[PDB]
Amino acid sequence: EVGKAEAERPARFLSSLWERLPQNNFLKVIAVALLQPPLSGEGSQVLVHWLLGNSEVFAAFCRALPAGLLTLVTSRHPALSPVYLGLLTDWGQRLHYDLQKGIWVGTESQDVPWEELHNRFQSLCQAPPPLKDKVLTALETCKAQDGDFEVPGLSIWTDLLLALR
């Protein structure tokens, strides 16, 4: 209706929404909205422009949902692959290893744990061919940037690539 009207852009509406209603609820709606096959997908095509436009909300999205949801988000809308991967890259690089418990852990309390990060890459790989190659190459590149070790306890990203067998 607002699209046909063309008086205000969906942006303004979704900005006001963002303040007004409960966010966890909201996001799941939006997530699922991206997937519903078309009813007149201009709808889905609008939401990706809103999201990629406003970074801050999209950071909470990837953080709030499950893994399979973001997997299907991506394979449908390739406009989401490269920035999502971008957010994982950026979370992995604020960890650190302790030797005494054999585990990657974050400094800060809110820093997506190893558990969570394993899982999402687990999924992203467990996906169709046009994304698996993309992501797997985005690992080998951030590995080499942080030293090509072939042993655990150095490169978060070596760790992961190993942990996928």
């Binding site: 054999g102 585990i103 655990p152 190993l162 942990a163 067998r165």
Partner: protein, 150 residues
């Protein structure tokens, strides 16, 4: 000690009561405790290594190792006894001298031959994927430390 070793290189019972019959076999605390060739050569190399005559030490230690392992043909030539160090603590001391020579490409043909014989023990490190419980004898952790310094 050098002289000692060559000494130990070279080797009758009366139907009567002689003294040695009544003499005991001596202990390890005795000053009449003298080991064997191999056991001593080890002392020499050991003693040498503590002084900082690393090169010499090495050669001693290699001669040690030659003796211990290569002795298939003649009379056996034994390892050091276990108030002393075990057969892997030794190889390490071999490789450590070889490092104080600056003979690092040898020190590695040693730590290679070591972990080659002893594959068929080791901890097969699947905890590598799952990461207190599994067992690593200190010496296997260390071989890796010195491979590294090499």
């Amino acid at each position: 000690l050098e002289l000692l070793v060559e000494a130990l290189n070279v080797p009758a019972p009366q139907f009567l009561i002689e003294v040695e019959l009544l003499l005991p076999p001596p202990d390890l605390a005795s000053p009449l405790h003298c080991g064997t060739q191999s056991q001593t050569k080890h002392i020499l190399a050991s003693r040498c290594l503590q002084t900082g005559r690393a090169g010499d030490a090495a050669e001693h230690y290699l001669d040690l190792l030659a003796l211990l392992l290569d002795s298939s043909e003649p009379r056996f030539s034994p390892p050091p006894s276990p108030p002393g160090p075990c057969m892997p603590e030794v190889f390490l001391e071999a490789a450590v001298a070889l490092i104080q020579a600056g003979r690092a490409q040898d020190a590695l043909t040693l730590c290679e031959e070591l972990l080659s014989r002893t594959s068929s023990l080791l901890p097969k490190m699947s905890r590598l994927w799952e990461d207190e419980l599994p067992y690593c004898p200190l010496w296997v952790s260390a071989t890796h430390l010195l491979q590294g310094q090499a």
